[PDB]
């Protein structure tokens, strides 16, 4: 209740989370990871490693290096500062109240940036069948006002993206920013083949792109990246934000990545897709006996998250989402690691709706 | 870019090849090490913030937030106050701070949508005076702010009196303490308190690198029961384990009796500083405060250093035989202390004679 008036011991202290060598007297990561982290981390607690770990992320999207990008303190904040910086230009263009255009399904750290940056969030209802927002109807919502149009790839809450490469014409056309969300599926996306539908810098007119390292660059959870364009008309304000610095969590992510490498990236990002292939067709397999009314997965997804949906009546009864509610299960190395996961939840979430 | 297949860790380690300072006992490098390790991938948070509550004198219901580093505990407020402030009907907000205080707050203002309004401090004191700033104060102000102290010179503002001047006005009232805050919360202000206990007060910020101890980029902003800030967190963190861990394990193994010994300690020093300084313009021949002299009556751990006759620019960059912070606008540096200029031995003496060799040159 209060900050120990006399030193604890190591002992003690460790004693609330010893293995170790010194003596003081969920996937769990390969013990010569854990530790080779621990000790870049007594190191750092370097210049050339941001540099490097960006130019990486910008080619993992397939980015130029005329473009610009930075490491924020981990998702929604890679969303502040595209979002921020946006409504700067906007303003310093001349516009007074400037508007965040985003579908419904768009991540809840939208209103938060308009509402901190001053800014006007117009939200565009998707298409209800698909889940994915209609760039059409999404063009009877862009005036002079929006700083910024914006396109999950994928949404949080139903797994499911918007077309991107579509959303982009309509950006030049319109001739306004257009920055992609991807701070959930970026670093699931950026090693698997997309290609005949991309969604990245190879969609022209997609200035800005954000993308959470954690979940699939299994970096711990603190770090991210926020990558504008070279027609990003954002530079024009860092060339005039939030976020501080933190050397060792640069190394963090500089170590973790490299450790993995990239095809180890893209086995997870196969697997974690064959799994969701794979609870799919234990699910639909129920209907081969409970109905598809009873529940069922929202659209056709195409990553790692899988959202249910129930007109009859399951979430947290399912011990063993918004507004049209909902759970999503968001599928992760682990969820592959474990054996047989499709036909445990499969039948165990049966288990909750009866 | 990125390594088409995991590299060995012997060769990432070789990448990372694995003016003062301070090194932690092995025994405490050895135990955040061991710490991280096992939080890098609880409740010890809701632990930090409410000592950290205690340690400003507030009670259990504020709310406190762990941020990343100064500014940004600082505009994490600034946009709670000015989001209010749009959410009553003041499309433009004024956060009302005095010229001395951060940058931080000009980002602020100018992420947040919100005026500046710079308030004129006294010239030769430091110190905002609250019949001044009182006449800034609007409708349409957000929130004012008064430093504790404010980094350039190491003088505070009246937070007492600016207490006064936010209960009778009722505006949120912000200390901005991210310098001296875990230097304060360790030596005795009862007298002229600088936290909650000051009514009227409706958020302090506080950085734990410098005076905590913690590792680079952890950071506190701490909301009472009574500030109005706390409604637009329950409408919507603003901005948003092992960070926890560092801290928690950091504050524990110190422990107040370290942190008030290194405290008042850092104090001594500088009244050590400040005294064998005057006592070098002593007598003849002969030297003088028109040359160099301490700006105010500091009373924590910056001094900052001015001149009159020389430029305080070509001294700071002259001493080459010191880690100084060369001050904009008004021409001068400040040295701030920390823990390690009271590890070596009577720091005071050698740093002026420093100190006057620099002077003697610019002369």
């Not at 450790?259 to 081969?288: C, D, H, M, P």
Request: proline letters at 5%; charged letters at 20%; glycine letters at 8%.
């Amino acid at each position: 209740e209060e900050i120990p008036e006399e030193g604890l011991s190591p002992q003690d202290i460790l004693s609330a989370f010893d293995v170790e060598k010194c003596h003081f007297d969920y996937a769990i990561h390969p013990k010569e990871l854990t530790e080779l982290l621990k000790e870049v981390y007594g190191a750092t607690a370097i210049n050339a490693m941001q540099a490097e770990v960006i130019r990486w992320c910008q080619n993992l999207f397939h980015g130029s290096k005329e473009g610009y990008g930075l490491l924020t303190h981990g998702g929604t904040t890679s969303i502040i500062e595209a979002m921020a910086a946006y409504v700067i230009r906007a303003r310093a263009k001349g516009i007074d109240y400037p508007e965040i255009v985003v579908p419904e399904t768009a991540h809840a750290a939208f209103k938060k940036a308009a509402e901190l940056t001053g800014a006007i969030l117009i939200t565009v209802p998707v298409d209800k069948k698909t889940g994915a927002v209609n760039p059409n109807v999404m063009s009877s919502y862009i005036t002079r006002n929006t700083a910024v149009m914006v396109g999950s790839a994928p949404s949080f809450m139903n797994g499911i993206h918007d077309p991107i490469s579509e959303l982009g014409q309509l950006a030049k056309k319109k001739n306004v920013p257009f920055h992609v969300d991807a701070c959930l599926g970026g670093f699931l996306t950026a090693f698997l083949d997309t290609s005949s539908e991309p969604m990245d810098f190879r969609v022209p007119g997609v200035t800005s792109i954000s993308a959470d390292l954690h979940k699939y660059g299994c970096c711990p959870k603190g770090t991210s990246v926020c990558l504008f364009s070279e027609d990003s008309p954002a530079l024009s304000v860092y060339a005039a934000l939030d976020g501080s610095t933190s050397g060792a969590r640069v190394a963090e992510v500089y170590a973790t990545l490299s450790y993995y490498g990239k095809n180890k990236y893209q086995e997870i990002a196969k697997s974690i897709i064959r799994l969701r292939n794979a609870i799919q067709k234990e699910l639909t397999a129920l209907v081969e006996e409970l109905t598809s009314e009873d529940i069922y997965v929202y659209g056709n997804p195409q990553w790692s998250i899988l959202g249910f949906r129930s007109n009859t009546c399951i979430a947290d009864e399912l011990e063993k989402l918004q507004n049209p509610d909902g759970f999503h299960l968001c599928l992760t190395h682990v969820h592959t690691l474990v054996g047989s996961f499709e036909t445990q939840f499969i039948k165990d979430l049966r288990e909750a709706v009866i």
